[PDB]
Amino acid sequence: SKEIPTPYMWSYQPQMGLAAGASQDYSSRMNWLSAGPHMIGRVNGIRATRNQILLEQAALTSTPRSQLNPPNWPAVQVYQENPAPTTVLLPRDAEAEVQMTNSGAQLAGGGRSSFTPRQAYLTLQSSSSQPRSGGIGTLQFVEEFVPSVYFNPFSGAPGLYPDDFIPNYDAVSESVDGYD
Amino acid sequence: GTFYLNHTFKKVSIMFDSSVSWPGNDRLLTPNEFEIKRTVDGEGYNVAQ
Amino acid sequence: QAAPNRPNYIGFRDNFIGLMYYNSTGNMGVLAGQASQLNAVVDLQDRN
């Protein structure tokens, strides 16, 4: 009961990207009620492994932070997207091409051109101007927010409980912004 | 297990948390539904005569 | 004793709407690529 708890699994928010408040795992339980002593000490020996795998997974994978389910993620702790700088091939450098038309030759069609020998091409940055904050994606929620195994559950002062397990709770208001 | 109303269906939508539509990421010819029976007109998606 | 017929003014619709007709599941239009022909205009039913 208190010692081998069925772990609190989270729920994903697709819109905000935050954690949608966790819930007790109620869809993987064995029905050990029809079992004598040689198996109900084996079933409890199984849950005591997934409550130890989930603690040796929470250290390898999750970011060490204070506020689990934070409302506003920082910039550096969110996966960014930095592709290669987009190498743009400029076709015809017009520093000597506008002289060709002013000589009288109208151009058409379209090295790269025969009248000019040179061909410059520029590169430019392909990332965003500012990195992204406020909300993690789906694969970040695959990575972080492993099911939190909560031992000796709800055993303390008010406010000392995990208040974000309530799937209605604002993390920076100490309150449900309810119907108003 | 002997059913006889198998033909009375149209669009079947499956959406997790009401915002990720599940055919996958726009995997079909309409990104938010499984079209059982396009009755009316329009494209010629109708196969199997 | 005569009396004049009542007039109307049969023009087109305001802003030509309904000529293209939108928001029909089926009989909707596409804007696709040549190399793939995947639709980028699917028209949902409940959107005027």
Added chain:
Amino acid sequence: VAPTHDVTTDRSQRLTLRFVPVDREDTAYSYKVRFTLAVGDNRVLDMAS
């Protein structure tokens, strides 16, 4: 078990897709079209489908 890798493409691919003729020949007995079937570098076929 299912093979958990090597089936799923996280990029938004497409299970099925119609193509459009880029010509036509309305001969009184014949009717000729040519197509432009092409893939995005990672989509093999069987062409019997």
